[PDB]
């Protein structure tokens, strides 16, 4: 059973949803920080007041997904609340917020996200995905892999967070026909053009997420820059990697505190992951081995 909260319980946990408690905002609604009766910290997602079908599909999906995936690198839905007027989902509080929240959209003078901490995120979040793809039956395509959906606990361990857009796929299928859903810039070209997704769209989304992680910027910010040179984002990044103009890419906020070889290898994973050819795109478990140490230089050689 999944804990069903009363609206009042969450009202009290949140101080009647005080603005002092807001962690995130969007068209979807709001996320409040909360504390339960037993001192448990939580994040409460209050959906917008308008009962459109998008939110509803997402709400039902997150709820159903509760018993299909369990893993230390996946955020687990602790509960829900459903009054006529209200839709709420409850999660474990993540002390250090979204990865995106730490990346230059970070408020005020919050301390920059150290490089070794970014490598840890890349690894942990890759494990969560590998799990969704290889060890769930049916396979789960997350379909919304991006910096905003990676939460960090007090030890900065990475947790992949939002399953509203998730898609079950038969373990044996190579694809499943479904509407194009996701975040612009994180949706795979083949999926965009055919409406046929697979785990490989997640890999592509992950690859872009890494660009966010290396750059410190949203996929949207990046796109504009690539255009300025009137080049496609991926040819732009690839071009910078090849010409050693990497200074142009790396999160300036990192100052310079990073090994030039480490960052490059991470960019390489990114590019391998975002290849237009899904079959050449590595499995997420291969990415995990790659990030751990094994197999990168070889796979990157097979690139050219």
């Amino acid at each position: 059973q999944l804990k069903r909260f009363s609206l009042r319980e969450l009202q009290v946990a949140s101080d009647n949803f005080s603005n002092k408690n807001i962690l995130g905002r969007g068209g979807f609604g709001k996320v409040y920080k909360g504390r339960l009766a037993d001192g448990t910290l939580v994040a409460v997602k209050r959906l917008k007041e308008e009962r459109t079908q998008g939110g509803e599909l997402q709400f039902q999906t997150e709820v159903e997904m509760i018993s299909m995936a369990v893993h230390r690198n996946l955020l687990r839905l602790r509960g829900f609340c459903m009054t006529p007027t209200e839709r709420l989902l409850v999660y474990p509080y993540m002390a250090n917020g979204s990865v995106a929240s730490c990346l230059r959209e970070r408020p005020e003078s919050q301390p920059p996200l150290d490089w070794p901490k970014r490598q840890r995120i890349a690894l942990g979040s890759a494990r969560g995905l590998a799990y969704l793809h290889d060890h769930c039956d049916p396979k789960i395509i997350h379909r919304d892999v991006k910096a905003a959906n990676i939460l960090l606990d007090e030890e900065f361990e990475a947790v992949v967070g939002d399953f509203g857009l998730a898609k079950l796929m038969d373990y044996k299928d190579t694809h499943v026909t479904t509407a194009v859903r996701g975040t612009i810039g994180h949706i795979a070209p083949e999926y965009l053009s055919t409406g046929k997704s697979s785990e490989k769209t997640d890999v592509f989304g992950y690859g872009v997420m890494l660009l966010e992680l290396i750059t410190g910027q949203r996929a949207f910010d990046l796109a504009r820059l690539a255009n300025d040179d009137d080049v496609m984002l991926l040819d732009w990044v690839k071009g910078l990697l090849k010409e050693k103009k990497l200074e142009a890419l790396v999160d300036v906020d990192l100052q310079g505190n990073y090994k030039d070889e480490e960052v490059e290898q991470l960019i390489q994973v990114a590019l391998l992951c975002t290849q237009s050819s899904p079959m050449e795109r590595p499995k997420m478990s291969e990415v995990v081995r790659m990030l751990e140490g094994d197999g990168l230089a070889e796979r990157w050689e097979e690139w050219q």
């Binding site: 998008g54 939002d162 509203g164 975040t183 810039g185 053009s193 409406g195 690539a226």
Partner: protein, 87 residues
């Protein structure tokens, strides 16, 4: 109230085809159009005012301004309907 994912998906495919029918009706350049839609949806390249109106005419509102998570969008549905028609 159980939401039907298939129905939602069917409606988007239908609103998109009705929209594509109109664009073919209005002599819009389609192999032309693939490009504006592809470059918009991937690279977030800003949509031409030329065609913004043409889409607005067909009821498809430019444009995917948000960097938010899309459960669906008319532009994405349309882009799929195009590629079906042109291999």
């Amino acid at each position: 109230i159980r939401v039907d994912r298939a129905a939602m998906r069917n409606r988007g495919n239908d609103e998109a085809d009705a929209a594509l029918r109109g664009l073919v009706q209005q002599g819009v350049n389609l192999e032309h159009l693939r490009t504006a839609l592809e470059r918009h949806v991937m690279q977030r390249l800003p949509i031409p005012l030329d065609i913004g109106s043409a889409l607005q005419n067909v009821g498809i509102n430019p444009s995917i301004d948000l960097g938010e998570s899309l459960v669906q969008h008319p532009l994405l549905n349309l882009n799929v309907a195009l590629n079906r028609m042109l291999g």
